Design a protein around this nucleic acid. Sequence first.
DNA 1: CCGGTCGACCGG
DNA 2: CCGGTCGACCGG
Lengths: 247, 249
Amino acid sequence: SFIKPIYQDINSILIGQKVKRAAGEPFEKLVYKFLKENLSDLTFKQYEYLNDLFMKNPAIIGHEARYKLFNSPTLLFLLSRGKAATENWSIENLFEEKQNDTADILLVKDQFYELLDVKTRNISKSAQAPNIISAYKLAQTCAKMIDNKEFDLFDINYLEVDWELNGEDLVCVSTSFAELFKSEPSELYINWAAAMQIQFHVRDLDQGFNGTREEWAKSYLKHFVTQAEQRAISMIDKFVKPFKKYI
Amino acid sequence: SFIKPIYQDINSILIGQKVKRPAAGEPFEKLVYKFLKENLSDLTFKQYEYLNDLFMKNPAIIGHEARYKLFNSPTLLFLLSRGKAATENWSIENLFEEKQNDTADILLVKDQFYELLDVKTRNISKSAQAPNIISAYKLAQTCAKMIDNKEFDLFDINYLEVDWELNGEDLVCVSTSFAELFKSEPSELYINWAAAMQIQFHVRDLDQGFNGTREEWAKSYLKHFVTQAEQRAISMIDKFVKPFKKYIL
DNA sequence: CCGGTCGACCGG
DNA sequence: CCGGTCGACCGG
Ligand code: NA
Ligand code: NA
């Protein structure tokens, strides 16, 4: 993480910030502004990076050659845009925000990528853990990490910022950082219904995993497979059995 | 529907109307409610606005059990209720508020009949997937309860699609569609399991040919739900197990 | 022509 | 500790 070494400074700048009263989205913009100020050469919106990548490679045209620019099957999977979009890219037609884009902010240095995702939380109440990442997308990432031996190329981190209401605006009250690959892979909760999303509040996540990235992957995949079997069996009990008497 | 008869008026006041850019389409939903509140005042309520009135018109009724008695129907209660602690802690000084869970956006009731209006916005500058309509699971439970209690002429669930696009510093509505759920072929509803188990379709293209009974609709969908769930159970092994079984050793 | 992904919420 | 629900998004 390129953000962690300066976390304390971020937590300091955010706490006390205000935004005009999804929902607390604007906070992710403050994180960007601050990350751009103290890590200008590493901070990129995901699309900003893609635009930058294609701009400095004029000779290269067409999706086939443009995909080769990533130089990584995994990063390609996680960052890349569509085929017809990589083909139609140009100076006069750049990449813009995309709702399902993997990362909020991308930090790159020495060929190392940090995929940052900002989660906002309303403290006034005690809600359910938010969507972290697709358990399936993650499952595919690990598989590719293994097929290509890319175990030192990137990290997936999360920054949570809690806000509270105060009049006609929202105010940051807390913050918390956590790395996905530092937590115990076999303990991630997979909410199948909620878009097969992994869920957890950042401030609760554990960070004591002490094995290799390759073991993390392999271990996650076993957890993923298991729960997929459990879900398949429970689906029958909850969505089928209690409704047969109507057929 | 209490909206169908004035669908032309709603469309008229929406098409071409601009709103300053800031969902990014909420403004149109607000415009729909405001119109309805001004042209069918006694029938229009925001889901939570209803619950409060219901509770307010019965001050002597405190405690959840009694308050739950106010709905006079299990099906509706399932669809409109707020839960134990929330229902119990309710007071005139601690009113119900909007909840991003509420089954409906707008409620229109008359002669004890209810219309659950859920309005869908769509950015026409993009050709996107069919959006979430309603939980197939919540639908299945609703159908079970309609049957178990014989409530087949109590309510309807309808949708209003509001098409819009960005134009300079503003947003403008360019079209509008309307459809009734209980008029579509139930065996045709697509249930997207991963997408919160929601049924998905573009209001614009929804079929309205169902000519059978409501009870027949309720039972038909239930069969369709069960089968799809079974089929899904099989799919999951195929997509999320078989191809990754080679990394577990 | 089928379905995955982002966002973030409480009741039990 | 567990897990549905709303919203609205294009590629494979
Ligand atoms: Na995410
Ligand atoms: Na809905």
